[PDB]
C-alpha cells in the first residue's frame, strides 16, 4: 500500500519533466546555495605542488517542477533519483577551467522538501594544484586555492552563493588534519568571475593558509651550523704557537660545514631561486672560513698575544649575533 502511493508520486513528478532545461531558463536566474565540510585535509605534495582533500560537498537549490504533496513533507530518496533529474554540473577546477582530479563515491544523497527545495550532497576526494613560493623557506606560508563552478552555465544562467555567512559556510573538521610538516592556520572564503573563451562563469574560491613548521630544520640545519660557528671562534682563545692543532681545527670545521650544507638541500627539490636557509648556511660558511683565515694572518706575524685575536674575539661573535637578530626578525615578524 505504501509503495503504491509513493510510486504514483514519483510518476507524477517525472510526468512531462524535461531534464534538458534548467529551472527558470526563461523566468529567473537559478540560485544555488553551497557549503563545504572538509572531513580531512590530505597531505601536501611539494614535488608536484598539489594537495589532496576529502570533503562532503553539499548543494541546495529550488526546482519548482518537483513540487509535491503527500504524507511526508520531505522525500529522502535513493541517490539513483539524482541521475534521473537535472542537477548542476558543478566541478572542481584548478586555475581557470581545467577540471581537477575528482573521485566521487556512488552514494550521492538527494532530499526533496515539499516546498520544492533540493539537497544534493556527494563525497569527493579532490587533488588540487597549489603553487608554492619557497623564497622564505622554511619560514614560508602558502594560500592553497580550491576553485569550483559551473562548466557550461554562465553567470547569466547560474549563480553560486554561500548557504550562510561566508566564513561559516566552509567548515573544517577538528581532527581532519593530515598535514605532517605544515600547520593549517585557517582559510578564507571568496567568490569571483572568470571570463574564458566559452563565456563568463562564476567561480567560488577558498584559500587555505598554510604555514611551514620550522622545527625540523632548526634541529637538522640551523642549530648544528650555529654551534659550528661558535665552535670555530673558540680558536681565537688558543695560543698562536699551536699551528698544527689550529690548522686541523680550521680545516675540519670547514669540512663539517660542507657536510652539513650538502645534506640540508638533499631533500628539497632543485629550485632555481635561493631560499632563506641557503643564505643562512652561506653566511655561516663564511664565518667558519674566515676564522681559519684569521689564524693564517696571525701566524704570518708570529715571530705576545696577537692583537688580531683579541679583536676577533669581539668582532666575530658580535657580527654573527647581529646577523641572527636581523635574519630571524625579518622572516618571523611576517
Amino acid at each position: 500500500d505504501n509503495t503504491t502511493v509513493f510510486t504514483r508520486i514519483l510518476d507524477r513528478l517525472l510526468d512531462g519533466y524535461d531534464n534538458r532545461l534548467r529551472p527558470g531558463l526563461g523566468e529567473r536566474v537559478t540560485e544555488v546555495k553551497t557549503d563545504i565540510f572538509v572531513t580531512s585535509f590530505g597531505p601536501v605534495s611539494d614535488h608536484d605542488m598539489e594537495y589532496t582533500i576529502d570533503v562532503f560537498f553539499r548543494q541546495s537549490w529550488k526546482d519548482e517542477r518537483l513540487k509535491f504533496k503527500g504524507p511526508m513533507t520531505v522525500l529522502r530518496l535513493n541517490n539513483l533519483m539524482a541521475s534521473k533529474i537535472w542537477t548542476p554540473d558543478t566541478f572542481f577546477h584548478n586555475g581557470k577551467k581545467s577540471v581537477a582530479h575528482n573521485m566521487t563515491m556512488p552514494n550521492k544523497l538527494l532530499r526533496i522538501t515539499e516546498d520544492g527545495t533540493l539537497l544534493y550532497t556527494m563525497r569527493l576526494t579532490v587533488r588540487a594544484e597549489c603553487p608554492m613560493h619557497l623564497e622564505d623557506f622554511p619560514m614560508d606560508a602558502h594560500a592553497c586555492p580550491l576553485k569550483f563552478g559551473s562548466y557550461a552555465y554562465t553567470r547569466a544562467e547560474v549563480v553560486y552563493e554561500w548557504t550562510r555567512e561566508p566564513a561559516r559556510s566552509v567548515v573544517v573538521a577538528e581532527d581532519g588534519s593530515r598535514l605532517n610538516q605544515y600547520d593549517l592556520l585557517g582559510q578564507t572564503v571568496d567568490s569571483g568571475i572568470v571570463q574564458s573563451s566559452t563565456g563568463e562563469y562564476v567561480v567560488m574560491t577558498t584559500h587555505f593558509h598554510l604555514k611551514r613548521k620550522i622545527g625540523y630544520f632548526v634541529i637538522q640545519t640551523y642549530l648544528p651550523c650555529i654551534m659550528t660557528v661558535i665552535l670555530s671562534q673558540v680558536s681565537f682563545w688558543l695560543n698562536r704557537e699551536s699551528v698544527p692543532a689550529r690548522t686541523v681545527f680550521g680545516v675540519t670545521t670547514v669540512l663539517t660545514m660542507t657536510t652539513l650544507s650538502i645534506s640540508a638541500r638533499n631533500s628539497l627539490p632543485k629550485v632555481a631561486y635561493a631560499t632563506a636557509m641557503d643564505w643562512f648556511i652561506a653566511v655561516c660558511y663564511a664565518f667558519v672560513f674566515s676564522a681559519l683565515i684569521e689564524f693564517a694572518t696571525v701566524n704570518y706575524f708570529t715571530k705576545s698575544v696577537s692583537k688580531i685575536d683579541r679583536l676577533s674575539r669581539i668582532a666575530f661573535p658580535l657580527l654573527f649575533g647581529i646577523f641572527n637578530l636581523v635574519y630571524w626578525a625579518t622572516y618571523l615578524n611576517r
Binding site: 699551528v243 690548522t247 680550521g250 680545516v251 670547514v254 660542507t258 650544507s261 650538502i262 638541500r265 628539497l268 632555481a272 631561486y273 635561493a274 631560499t275 641557503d278 643564505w279 648556511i281 652561506a282 653566511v283 660558511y285 663564511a286 672560513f289 674566515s290 681559519l292 683565515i293 693564517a296 694572518t297 701566524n299 704570518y300
Partner: protein
C-alpha cells in the same frame, strides 16, 4: 733543495696558474666559450640573489670583471713577483674564495660545482702558513 723550498714554489705557481685561468674564463671566452656562457649565468643569479648589491648600481658585468681582474692580477703575482707582495696577493685570494663560496652556498649549488674552489682554499692558506720560517 729542501722540501719546503720546493713545495712552496709549486703551490704558489699552481694556484696562480689555476686562478688566472679561472679569471680568464670570466673575461675572455676564447679559452672555453661554453665555460663563459655558463659562468655568466652563475653571476646573474648571485646578484639577482643579492638585491642590495644591485641597489647600489653594481651589475653582474661589473661583478664578473672585478673578481676576474683580481684573480689574474693576484695569480700572476703569486707566480713571478717574490717577496711581501707575493704574500699580500695570497691574502686577497683568501678574501675572494669565501666570497665565491658565499655565492655558491647562497644558491645551493652541488659540491662538484664549488669543489675546485674549496680544494684550492685549503692549499691557498696552507701556502701562507709556509710563507716564511
Amino acid at each position: 733543495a729542501s722540501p719546503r723550498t720546493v713545495t712552496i714554489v709549486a703551490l704558489s705557481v699552481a694556484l696562480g696558474l689555476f686562478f688566472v685561468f679561472m679569471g680568464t674564463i670570466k673575461l675572455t671566452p676564447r679559452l672555453s666559450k661554453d665555460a663563459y656562457s655558463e659562468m655568466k649565468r652563475a653571476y646573474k643569479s648571485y646578484v639577482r640573489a643579492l638585491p642590495l648589491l644591485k641597489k647600489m648600481g653594481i651589475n653582474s658585468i661589473l661583478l664578473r670583471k672585478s673578481i676576474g681582474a683580481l684573480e689574474v692580477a693576484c695569480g700572476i703575482v703569486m707566480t713571478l713577483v717574490p717577496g711581501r707582495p707575493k704574500d699580500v696577493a695570497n691574502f686577497f685570494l683568501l678574501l675572494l674564495v669565501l666570497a665565491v663560496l658565499f655565492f655558491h652556498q647562497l644558491v645551493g649549488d652541488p659540491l662538484k660545482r664549488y669543489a675546485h674552489a674549496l680544494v684550492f682554499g685549503i692549499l691557498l692558506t696552507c701556502r701562507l702558513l709556509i710563507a716564511r720560517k
